[PDB]
Amino acid sequence: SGQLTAELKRVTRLAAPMATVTIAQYLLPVISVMVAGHNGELQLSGVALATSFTNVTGFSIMYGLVGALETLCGQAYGAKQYEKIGTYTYSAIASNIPICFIISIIWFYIENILISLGQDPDISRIAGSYAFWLIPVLFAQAIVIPLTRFLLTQGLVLPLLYTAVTTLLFHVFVCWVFVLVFVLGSNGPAMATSVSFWFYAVILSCYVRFSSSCEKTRGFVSEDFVSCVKQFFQYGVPSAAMICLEWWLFELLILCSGLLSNPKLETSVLSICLTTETLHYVISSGVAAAVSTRVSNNLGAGNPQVARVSVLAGLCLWLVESAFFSILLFTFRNIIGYAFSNSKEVVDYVADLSPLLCLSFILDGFTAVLNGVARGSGWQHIGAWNNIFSYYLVGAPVGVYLAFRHDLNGKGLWCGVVIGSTVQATVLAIVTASMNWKEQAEKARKRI
Numbered sequence: 001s002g003q004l005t006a007e008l009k010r011v012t013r014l015a016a017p018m019a020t021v022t023i024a025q026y027l028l029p030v031i032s033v034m035v036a037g038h039n040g041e042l043q044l045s046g047v048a049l050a051t052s053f054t055n056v057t058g059f060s061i062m063y064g065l066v067g068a069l070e071t072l073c074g075q076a077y078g079a080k081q082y083e084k085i086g087t088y089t090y091s092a093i094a095s096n097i098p099i100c101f102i103i104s105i106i107w108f109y110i111e112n113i114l115i116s117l118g119q120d121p122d123i124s125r126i127a128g129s130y131a132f133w134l135i136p137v138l139f140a141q142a143i144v145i146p147l148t149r150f151l152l153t154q155g156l157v158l159p160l161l162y163t164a165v166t167t168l169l170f171h172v173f174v175c176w177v178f179v180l181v182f183v184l185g186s187n188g189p190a191m192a193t194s195v196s197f198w199f200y201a202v203i204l205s206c207y208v209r210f211s212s213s214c215e216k217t218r219g220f221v222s223e224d225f226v227s228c229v230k231q232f233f234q235y236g237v238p239s240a241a242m243i244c245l246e247w248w249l250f251e252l253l254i255l256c257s258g259l260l261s262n263p264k265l266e267t268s269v270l271s272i273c274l275t276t277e278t279l280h281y282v283i284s285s286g287v288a289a290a291v292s293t294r295v296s297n298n299l300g301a302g303n304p305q306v307a308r309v310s311v312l313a314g315l316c317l318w319l320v321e322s323a324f325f326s327i328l329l330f331t332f333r334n335i336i337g338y339a340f341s342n343s344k345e346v347v348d349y350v351a352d353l354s355p356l357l358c359l360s361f362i363l364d365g366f367t368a369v370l371n372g373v374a375r376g377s378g379w380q381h382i383g384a385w386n387n388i389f390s391y392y393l394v395g396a397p398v399g400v401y402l403a404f405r406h407d408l409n410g411k412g413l414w415c416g417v418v419i420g421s422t423v424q425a426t427v428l429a430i431v432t433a434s435m436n437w438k439e440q441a442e443k444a445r446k447r448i
């Protein structure tokens with residue numbers, strides 16, 4: 001009772017700003033698409049195919065790698081190794097640059113890749129140009145996302161929130177400018193995203209460089225620069241997979257929906273369900289980041305007990321958040337489809353799909369908090385191999401079978417999600433109960 005209250009206050013102190021941070025982070029591509037309008041059926045499929053490509057190969061890796069910074073910097077703030085936080089962060093930037101180069105090399109070929117996959121050459125040309133103008137966003141994120149974990153792993157969530165909201169409003173302005181006054185064309189939104197993310201880079205760099213809050217953590221020691229890069233890849237390769245295997249699968253999901261009977265019907269309804277799923281996953285990502293932060297810090301501080309109650313408090317947040325969003329959807333299960341489409345067949349499809357998505361809500365929340373525990377403790381490789389096991393070896397076969405042979409074209413798809421997500425939580429539950437907190441604190445000591 002006395003221990004839960006203590007960490008519940010500090011986990012929530014990180015949970016709310018990072019939740020709003022995540023809201024402002026996913027509401028940025030939505031702003032790109034909305035400002036552009038429907039310039040054309042060709043440009044619609046070209047930009048969608050471009051941003052889907054870019055997210056599958058390059059962006060998921062970049063966003064997933066600094067799970068290494070969540071464990072390394074997160075445990076380093078607990079042991080008060082304040083020089084190593086800056087060393088880990090700037091070694092992450094240095095590591096991200098050659099990876100950005102590789103991804104850009106691959107992006108130069110996107111047109112020839114898509115035409116070889118059997119797509120329209122003109123759609124592949126639009127996608128090639130749009131993806132080519134998203135290259136500055138790669139190196140910009142190589143600066144921003146390590147800085148993101150730099151502020152998060154210490155508890156400086158408010159500078160992250162202020163700079164994120166500022167970046168969102170900036171992106172609204174220059175998307176308006178680029179699309180409406182500069183009339184660039186289809187790639188206007190892409191270049192506006194490059195400008196916005198570099199603005200995010202200079203404001204985060206400005207705060208970290210000129211603020212008293214980051215006086216103890218800013219700066220890197222030259223000697224350890226070779227060691228930290230090694231350690232970052234140690235915990236970067238699994239974490240990146242733990243993100244890629246999810247985004248890739250969701251991409252596979254939408255393509256599978258395009259091969260069913262009535263493809264527009266099932267694809268529109270499935271896009272509704274997964275937009276809803278991610279819209280809850282942003283708050284679920286906020287609670288996950290908070291749990292990862294506090295557990296990593298308590299493991300670094302040599303206190304496994306407070307790390308346990310850290311997990312408990314995050315599960316409490318999961319309970320109230322997931323019950324809230326689940327019951328809230330179920331109240332408007334028969335109307336919420338009207339917000340997405342005007343066809344009556346679609347609204348009833350998502351209406352029948354609503355309880356299964358409620359299960360997806362509570363499952364995604366549970367697996368996100370426990371995956372945050374995995375990132376904060378340092379066993380991300382468990383999460384990666386469980387991702388392949390839960391979604392590719394179980395969920396995808398049961399999802400494909402139920403959807404195609406059982407005349408459950410759209411619902412069967414989502415059933416493969418739920419069962420897969422369920423298996424995911426089950427193993428994530430076992431490994432978080434059997435795990436020794438005594439050793440994780442001692443193991444965190446030698447990591448840092």
Ligand SMILES: CCCCCCCC/C=C\CCCCCCCC(=O)OC[C@H](O)CO
Nearest residue numbers: 378379381382383385386389427431435443
């Ligand atoms: C039933 C189907 C299951 C499918 C497979 C799902 C993944 C779980 C597999 C093994 C976890 C075993 C528990 C391992 C706990 C130790 C984690 C750890 O920290 O290992 C670090 C290691 O010493 C390096 O330095």
